[PDB]
Each structure stands twice: as C-alpha cells, then as structure tokens.
Amino acid sequence: TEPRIGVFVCHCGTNIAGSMSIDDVVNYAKTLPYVAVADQYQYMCSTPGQKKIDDAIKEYNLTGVVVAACSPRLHEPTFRTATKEGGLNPFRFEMANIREQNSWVHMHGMWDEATQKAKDQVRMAVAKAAKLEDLVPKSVPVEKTAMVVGGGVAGMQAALDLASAGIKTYLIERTPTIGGRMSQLDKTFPTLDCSQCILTPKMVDVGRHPNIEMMTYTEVEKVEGYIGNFDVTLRKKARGVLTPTEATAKGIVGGGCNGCGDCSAVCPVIKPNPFEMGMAPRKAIYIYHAQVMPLIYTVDFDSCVKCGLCVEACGDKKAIDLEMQDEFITVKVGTAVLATGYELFPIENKREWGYKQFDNVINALEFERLICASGPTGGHLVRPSDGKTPMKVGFVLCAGSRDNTGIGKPYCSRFCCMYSLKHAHQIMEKIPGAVAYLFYMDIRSFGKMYEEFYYRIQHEGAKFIRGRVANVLEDKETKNLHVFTEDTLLGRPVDVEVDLLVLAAAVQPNEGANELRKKFGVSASQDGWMLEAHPKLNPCGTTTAGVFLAGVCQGPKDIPDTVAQAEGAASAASIPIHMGEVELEPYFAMCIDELCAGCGMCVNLCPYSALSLGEKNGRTVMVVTEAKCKGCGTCGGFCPGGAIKMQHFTTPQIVAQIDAFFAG
Amino acid sequence: SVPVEKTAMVVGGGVAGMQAALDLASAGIKTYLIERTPTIGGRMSQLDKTFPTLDCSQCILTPKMVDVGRHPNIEMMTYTEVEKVEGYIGNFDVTLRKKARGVLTPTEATAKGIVGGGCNGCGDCSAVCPVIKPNPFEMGMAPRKAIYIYHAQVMPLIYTVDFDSCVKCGLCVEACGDKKAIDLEMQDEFITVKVGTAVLATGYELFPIENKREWGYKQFDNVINALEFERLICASGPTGGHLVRPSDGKTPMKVGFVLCAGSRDNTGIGKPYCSRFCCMYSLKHAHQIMEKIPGAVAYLFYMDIRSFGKMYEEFYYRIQHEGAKFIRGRVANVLEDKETKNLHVFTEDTLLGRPVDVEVDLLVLAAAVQPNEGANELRKKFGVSASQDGWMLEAHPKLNPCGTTTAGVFLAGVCQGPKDIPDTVAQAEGAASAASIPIHMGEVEL
Amino acid sequence: DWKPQILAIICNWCSYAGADLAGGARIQYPPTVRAIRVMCTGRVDMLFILKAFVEGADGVLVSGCHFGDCHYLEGNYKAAKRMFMIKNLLRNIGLDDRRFRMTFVSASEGAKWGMVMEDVTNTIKELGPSPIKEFKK
Ligand SMILES: Cc1cc2nc3c(=O)[nH]c(=O)nc-3n(C[C@H](O)[C@H](O)[C@H](O)COP(=O)(O)OP(=O)(O)OC[C@H]3O[C@@H](n4cnc5c(N)ncnc54)[C@H](O)[C@@H]3O)c2cc1C
Ligand SMILES: Cc1cc2nc3c(=O)[nH]c(=O)nc-3n(C[C@H](O)[C@H](O)[C@H](O)COP(=O)(O)OP(=O)(O)OC[C@H]3O[C@@H](n4cnc5c(N)ncnc54)[C@H](O)[C@@H]3O)c2cc1C
Ligand code: SF4
Ligand code: SF4
Ligand code: SF4
C-alpha cells in the first residue's frame, strides 16, 4: 500500500510512438497495483523531461519512479540524477527498455503485439520498483602508505614514482642491495650504455628519498587484510652490521659501517659470491659489489665461524653484532606492488648441452659477469678450462625455450635474442679477430631500434646459422666444444668448433615467488607467472584488490617495458591513496547472519575471495568483505537458505518481476 | 620555483589516450581529452578480436569508453585539434580548434538558449541525407551520409556532419525538427586553455603500400591490407562479417598472408624497422578465416615469426595445430589471372629449398605502421624531437620511456613506437603518473 | 491463436548489450521473449527457473557470456553447472527438457540474438503449451 510509483513513457520522437500505442501503455499503467501517476512525453532525456519527473515527484509524493524509455545502459545515470534531484534515492529508479528491445525490432506489421510487449515490460518494471530500497553510497578508507616488494629496476621505479607522488613507501628487498638483475649486466641492448652508470643515479635517488623506507635484506612473512588496509608482517633478517642510524638508536655515538672494508680484509672465510654467479670469492662479511646502494657489509651467519677478527677490524665503531637474530615488524600499508623479478631456468637438465659437465659451457648471466670490467677478471673473457682467451664463441639461442618436451619452457623469453646479439658484439669488439657464431631459430628483434641493432651485428661480422643445436661434444685434449646441428638454410649438417659456448637459457620466476604471490592471494598464470586482472586492458592489476604487478614477475620483458609497467603499477596503486577512499560497488552482497548456517560452501565460490567464514555472536557465520565484492551475484544465487542479500537484485525483487510477467 | 596548474591535457583519444585521461582523472586532476575524430575509440575500435586471447575488441573497450564520457574530471573535446602551444611546464597556454561539428550536444543547445536538446542520437537525420560518401572508419569500403557517425558504439554519439561534402539541402534539419540540433552555418571555434602537463598519444596509421609494385595492392582487386581484412571479418563491418572477395563477392576458400610487407627493408621504400605486431594479427586472421569459413586454408609467407610476449608462442602453437601452413619465404611478386582474379604468389620456400607458386583467392598484406598524418606538426608544436625511425623521441631509451626532453610533456602509445595493446596501456598509465607528479606536488624547479 | 510465454534472464554485460546492438541495427524478430536483466547470469538461482516454469512459463531462456568472457570472470561457469542440473531435473520430472536453454551471446552478436529469438520461438511453438498449466498448479 505504501509504495507509490510514477510511470513515465517516452515517445523518443516517433522512434517509439511509431511502433506501439503510447496512449494504450499509459492507460494500462494507470491501473497497475502501485501507480500514482502515468504520464507521456516526447523527449524525456532532455531538460523538460527531468523537470516533469521532478514536478511529478513533488506533487504526487512518489515513493519511486519507473521510466519506459531506451536501455538503462544509455540513460540510467541521467535519470538517477534526475530522481536524486527531487528528494529520492538514486537507486529507487527503475527503467523499462521499450526502444532497443521492443520498438526497433518490432516495426513491420507488429502493432498490437508490440503494445502488448510494452505493457508486459512496464508491468515487470513497476513490479520490481515497488520493492526497491535505499542504497546509501559508502566507502572504505585507505591507509596512505604503499609497499613495494622487490628492489630491482621495476621495484625501484615504482618506489620512486610513489614517493615523488607524495606517498610514504616501503621498498622490501630480499638481498642486501637493491639493484637487481640490471646491476649484473655489463652493457644494455641496443644502445650499449653501461648498466651501472645509468642505474647508479636511480639507486642513490632511492637511497636519499625521504618518502622511501629502503628495507633491504628482509622479506614478507605474512599478509592479511584487503585493499583498504593490508596488515603485513615482515622479518628483518639478521644483518649482523648496524647502520649509523641503528647505531645511534642502539646507544653508541660511534657510527655504524661507513663502508671502509677492513672487516672483509681480515676475514679468514672464503665463499662464493651470488652476485658474480658463484665465480668469485667473498668473505663471510661482505658486499655484493662496490656499487651497492646500502654500503653496509652484511655478514653471512651460516658461514661465519665467529672468530671475532672483524670486530677488531671495526674498533671504535662497533658496527658488528655477531649474536643478533631476526626481528619481526608489523607494517600497515594501503596498497602493494609485487616486483619479484626472475631467475635462470636450470639448464643443467637438457643433457645434450653440457652446461655442468663441460667446463667451457656457460650461461648468459655468467657471460655478463665475465665480460664486465667489475667481474671476477678484468673484463677479459677467458676460458674457464685454462684461462686462455677464446677466439671462437658460439651462442645457443632458445636454450630451454619454445620447448614442449616438459623439460624446458614452452614460451619465448623475449630478450635472449637481443642480449645474445649484444654478447656477440662485445666479444667481436673486445677480442680482435674473434668470431661469434649464433645458432638461432627465429631471430626476434621486435622493439624500437632492435632491427637496426640486428643489422649492425650482422654488418660487424657475426655469423648466423639458422638451426637449433642438436648436441654438444667436447675434445678431451683441448677442452673445445663441437656443436652439432643443421644449417637449415643451405640445408646441410654442420659441426662448428668453438672455444666457448654460451647458452641463452630461459627465464623463470625467482625461487620463493610463488609462495609470496600465494601470500597476497594472487593467482599464477598457465606459464607460471603472476596472473593479471585483464590480459588486455589491465596489465598492471590483479583480481585481488589493492595488489599490482610490475616487471618480469608479470612476464619476461626488456628494461624499458619493465619501467613502463612499474610506472603504470605505481599510478594504479597511487590512485586510491590519492583519493583517500575506495567507493564500494552500489550493489554488494550482505550476509543476513540470522539466516546463515555456517556451511561455508559459498566461500570458494567467489572469484575475488570476498567471502570468508567468521565468528559472530558465538556462531560461525559468513563475513562479506565489501571492499572485494563486485555485485556479481554468484553467492546470492547459490545459497539455499537465502542468507545472502544481493541488494537492488534481491530474490524478492527478481521473483516479483517473474510474478508480474505471468500476471494479467 | 614555479607553480603548476592543476590541469592536464591528453592529445589523442585512443586506448592510450583514454587510459591516460582515466588515470589522471582518477588521481583527481582535471583533464582535457582532445580527439581529432568525432569519436574517441581509436584503432582498437576497428579490430574484431584480439590476439592472443581472441576476446572481442569493442566489448572490452566499451566500459572504458563509457567511463571517459561520464567522468566529471575529464572534458572530452572530440572533433578538435591543437592550433598552438606556448609556455612551459608551469603554465601551458594551449589554443584549440573546435572544428565545426554541425550538431549541438544538449549542453551546447542549453547554452545557446533553446530548451530543445541536441541530438539524442536517434539517427533520423542520416536516414534522409541524399549524399553518399566513403566511411573512414571502414576507410572507403562502406557508404555513409554527409551527416553520420563512425559506427554504432561511438562514445560521443552526436552525429557529426562533413561540411566539405554536405550540399546544404536541409532535409536533416526537418528530420531533426523540434530539437534544433543541426546548425548548418556554424564554423570553427578558437578556445584557449591553461594546462600544467601534456600527454601525447597520437597513435599510428598504415604505411602506404601502393608502392612496392610487386604486390599489386591497388592494382589487383583481391589484394587487401590488414585493417581492410579486420573490417571485412568483423560482424559489424561493411558486410555481415562474411569474408568475400572484392572482385566478385564470392567466398574465398584460400587466402595468403604476406608478412613483413614494407618492413625490415633497407631499399628506402619501406621501413627498416619491425612493426612488432604484424605476425600476431596475421596469426589471428588465419585463425579467424579457418574458423569462420569451413575448409578454407591459410598460407602465411613469413620470415622470423615473432611471437615474443605473454601467451604469444602458445597462440602460434594453436594456429599451427589448426592447420595453418607456414612457408618460410618473403614473397617475391604477385600476378593475377585475368579470367578469375586469383592471385599467384611467387616466392621461395627456403626450408625445403624450392621455388613456390601459390594460388590464393585472397591476399592480405601485413603492412608496416607509420606515424599518423599531422603528427610531426603536433610534435613540433610541443617541441618534441623525433627518433631515427621517425617516431617521437623519449627522454632516455631505458629509464625514461615516457618522458621527453622538454619538461611537462610525456608520450604514450604507438606514437613512441609500435606496441601491443597491453604495452600501450602500460605506457599510458606510466605517462599519466609522470604527468601527475608535478600536479600533485603543485610546484617544479627549473 | 495460442501465444507462447517465453521468459529470458540475460546478463547485463554481454547478452543485454547484444540485444541492444540488435535493436540498434534494426534486426527484426518476433515479439515473444521478455527479459529480466540480472548482472551476471550467475545471479540466476535454480529457484528462479523453477518458479518460472511453475507459474506458467512455456519456455525459459538464459543468456550469458562466452566462457572466458564473463565480466566477473567466473559467473557463467556456475550458471552452466546450474543449468545442466536444471536440464536433468526437467527431464526427470517429466517435463520436456528442450523447453529450457542457455545461450552464450556476446556484446557484438546482434544477429545471433535475433537468430536465437527466432529459434526459441519456433521450438516453443512446436512443443506447445506447458503441461504444468493443465495439471492443477
Ligand atoms: C643475461 C641477460 C641480459 C640482459 N640484457 C638486457 C639488456 O641489455 N637490456 C635490457 O633492457 N634488458 C636486458 N635484460 C633483461 C633485464 O634484466 C630485465 O628486463 C630486468 O632485469 C627486469 O627487471 P626486474 O626488476 O623486474 O627484475 P629483477 O632485477 O630480477 O627484480 C627482482 C628484484 O626483487 C628481489 N626479490 C625477488 N624475490 C623477492 C622476494 N620474495 N622478496 C623480496 N625481494 C625479492 C630480487 O632480489 C631483485 O632485487 C637481460 C637479461 C638477462 C638475463
Ligand atoms: C591490423 C591490426 C591488428 C591489430 N590487432 C591487435 C590485436 O589483436 N591485439 C592487440 O593487442 N593489438 C592489436 N593491434 C595493435 C593495436 O591496434 C595498437 O596497439 C593500439 O591501437 C595502440 O593504441 P593507440 O591509442 O596508441 O593508437 P590509436 O588508436 O591510433 O590512437 C590514436 C588516436 O588519437 C587520434 N589522434 C591522432 N593524431 C591526433 C592529433 N594530432 N590530434 C588529435 N587526435 C589525434 C586518432 O584519431 C586516434 O583516435 C593491431 C593493429 C593493427 C594495425
Ligand atoms: S530517454 Fe531514451 S527514448 Fe526517451 S527521448 Fe531520450 S534517448 Fe529517446
Ligand atoms: S669494518 Fe666496520 S665500518 Fe668497515 S666495512 Fe666492516 S662493518 Fe663497515
Ligand atoms: S667473526 Fe665471522 S665475519 Fe668476522 S672475521 Fe671471523 S669469520 Fe669473518
């Protein structure tokens, strides 16, 4: 009895009136159960139409309004604003599509039938509108901090972008230094710029920025919460050496680790260096290389013998604490960016290339470290077998890639063609008279200035044999490598003699990346990389709200593409922080806990993990995280007990439409 | 040192420009979205499906397009051009040419003084126009009137009119009576706005393959380019999505794809670079012909199939599995039979090492991409340099792919170099962030 | 002249957009099917379809998005499970399981929407009125 509904029918200027009797529709609507006024007008998407709607609202005191007009996706915001201007809730408005679905498809010889269909549509719309409630828009506050996991070029770029946007940001790096893979590269294709030179300003900018907390040598222990508020627990690994800030906080005025290096000079323990791919010695207390952002000299506790000589080497500064353990910090962030990067696929498998059993077979990262001036040698590429300079280097492209055998990877690694060309150029430049052979199977120079780079590499004298390497033997006397394949162009078998063989191995996610992406509720892709919110129109986002992806952890990329992805992720993460609120969907699900039975079937039924099972008044019931719900309606349509309320699309309102369809 | 106006300008309403404008608006900055064409959609609105997920292009783009129009922080100036830009990163005084739309929006009609709204989009005007011209959205293959829209799913649906082709008979005026949306005597308007930063997203066009005479693109009637094939294969194209031969309208059983058409060429006619996506939409076209037309076979005359991205190689595997033939040889030349306009493609299959002459009912050229016309003039208006390849130059090739040497100007999309849609969107978001930095700080030092 | 009573429940993002596009392209089809316009067609409970059939529906059509094209990424699979079980239920209760169907119409297929309307109308006219109306409901 209480609901009073007003029905307004648009002619659309003979677009609707030319196919059906508008007078019949109005005279029929005048007799529906809850109808105070029924009116017709020519163009109700115009200002006089809104004026008439408001006048009718005021003068009949309508509870709700039904407009028989074009599709809701065309003019629903228009009429919602019209109804709101007039003293009614925006979501109290209902629309009957009588143009795109009744008048433009029933033109010829269907006059009574089109009018009858219009009557039915208006009846169903009025039936739904008689049961519409008030949806007050509500939002969730956003913590004004951001977290970036991974200190590589993507993580560094995202952190700098978020900081320069005015947002306090945490940069979480597993290693004692941030630089990442870019720090390991000697040169960069196709410009041949020095990698450390172009990256050092970025590293010092990250180190100096007041809006970035650069927490290195630490990782994520656990994560809870949603887009509004992520409670993230981090473990600070026992660094063993104090920064000057930490030294002052500890109590001693003596600074902590100005980076002199005396401790490493006196340490008696020798261990491999992960930064140099294990080809260089390092002490228990060490730095990765000279150009590390935090120059703080980590100590390797599982290799240290606690001989206590580094402490005398560091006297009057007291930077070394040999007996401290990992700390735990609880940080409250608003959004998160994942930039975990990549590692090399283990090419010790795929036995026909003797990566581990032949000494002069190396991978691409080892080659980069060996040819860089800061590597184990003075930038002089030498054979690991005897230290003599090579004159003949082969490059095996696609090593473990585009492989469907189940050992390698079925995808392309994107950059192995380009850095193989860069390596060929570097060997042909640094060693005079050396010849580079590239055993290739689809040279892929797709990026800007990449084809020109390929042309230049061929012009400088590199040999391109179009054939995937079949197998590799080695001569016992001289540890040179026989490479057996076919030159498919020229159509002949080929056995190439090389002093050095470099495998362009595939790339895979870093170890522990899958555990991290599970910790944030991010699904993997069918290649094993992190999945995207939409492969086309949202390369940065993720199904879980407030989490964004940047860099090769989303998929192998070049440095420029990685930086573009990182900046996009930073922008997407900054948007909710800048706004300060996340507006909830107008039509989220609500659990009526008086009807929930705590079965928990619906929990695994939401794509966005909004639904969870939690206590309330001592009863186990379902809890809806409104920040994650998107109004899909899957849960509400499943629950047998009807304990989930899909507002504006509730079971009573939909059944009311179905009931009115079979009414008079 | 100098204040920054809390406004931004995005030139180009393509997917890059749309994404940049949406990102800037969501950050809270008032943004101008400047579009040359009457609609914003861009090249992505012309595609039928998208590699490698085979999703429908309009369906993904329609929500993003609807948002730009509704968004209150974005003023969407379509059918407008940048006349002049003066100033610097602090204040950019940009004067814009509102070309004569010929039809008023309801806001403009209200401002004029008449209560009659302007152009609800009924389409009655186009039903009476006696002039029939080619449609640039279908680009010469479908008819359109003097007053028209590019397609049904246009963001601003206001039915522009081409005054260079209109005869001013006034029949659309009577077709739109009582709304008074059509004013046949209106002309260009000059507006001046002040913006803090600018984002350039001008996009790309097709390289003119009337040259390379060995492929009779404009000579033989059954030789088409990639975008013509996309328009022909889409269900909303000139036909009902049925790929038919332009020569006689019959359904082809056999079509060839000439990859690298005008690409990776050092002869001075084509382009010396790779267009970075010819291979993938060629594979997509092969899939579409094999699915839509039963028994039709695709031949791809290729050279270094380049499926480098995420799920690109698996798409290649699927295409080969569906039965696509891959001949590794650049097409030497193309002849046609005078009687039945079939196309003889002469090349070598370098694998198998033999000369090859392949009959095809249809031939599709995967032409290289080029900067749009007038993009160099606009690039000079903002003081941006060009690359050696002719694309707009970035500040640093590695660590600043979006910024330019000139302050306050940022690049996004294919205007910086050929890219896929996800790469374009990532670049657009990065450019939006770089433009938002000075506005959010509200001050820069020079 | 008995008039068939077909009820449609079509998702907002693909099927409703497809019907709108069909209307925009002026594609004609008989005026027999009326729609409901839920958000995701995963909102469709089985009780909706069963209530429609009990109340006197002659046929029921549910239209969603193609698999992998749902706006909410998983709804149409839940809908597909529910509609498979619904087809089992209508067969095993003695109803004609061909009176009910679920189609996958995208937002670019207006002609497909018209074809689906024609096919549904023809099938329901062939099957005749629901038996449930004769038996006391
Ligand atoms: C041999 C070789 C040569 C190359 N040459 C070039 C070239 O010339 N030009 C070019 O443009 N590109 C080149 N590339 C590609 C380039 O290295 C990548 O594009 C780039 O490094 C990717 O950036 P990223 O920061 O995402 O990767 P990464 O640097 O790997 O980022 C990962 C970072 O996050 C940290 N991290 C990982 N997991 C965790 C965790 N769980 N918690 C915390 N921190 C974590 C890592 O320690 C690291 O600091 C080359 C690649 C290789 C392998
Ligand atoms: C045949 C073909 C098939 C493709 N298929 C796919 C596919 O399946 N999947 C995929 O991911 N990618 C595909 N692509 C690539 C895709 O089209 C591009 O990545 C994308 O269009 C780039 O978007 P953009 O906005 O930068 O370009 P555009 O859409 O060209 O953006 C330029 C826009 O700005 C406007 N504009 C230009 N100059 C000016 C000016 N001076 N003033 C004002 N406005 C201006 C233009 O009118 C246009 O609206 C395909 C490309 C082609 C050619
Ligand atoms: S509301 Fe819709 S049907 Fe009515 S005049 Fe406006 S566009 Fe036409
Ligand atoms: S000796 Fe002390 S100050 Fe010197 S590098 Fe080691 S920790 Fe730092
Ligand atoms: S205590 Fe450990 S780190 Fe220090 S010198 Fe001895 S072995 Fe090296």
Ligand code: SF4
């Ligand atoms: S980038 Fe080149 S070498 Fe690496 S997998 Fe792809 S085709 Fe093979």
Ligand code: SF4
């Ligand atoms: S809402 Fe329904 S399905 Fe979910 S736990 Fe409660 S009773 Fe079970």
Ligand code: SF4
């Ligand atoms: S409506 Fe969809 S997203 Fe929201 S709680 Fe239900 S299933 Fe999850």
Ligand code: SF4
């Ligand atoms: S006839 Fe008038 S109202 Fe209709 S589309 Fe043309 S200008 Fe707009």
Ligand code: SF4
């Ligand atoms: S005045 Fe121009 S646009 Fe209007 S009907 Fe005549 S030719 Fe067409």
Ligand code: SF4
């Ligand atoms: S993308 Fe493919 S077809 Fe296009 S130029 Fe590059 S290799 Fe040739």
Ligand code: FES
């Ligand atoms: S939105 Fe249509 S199937 Fe889910």
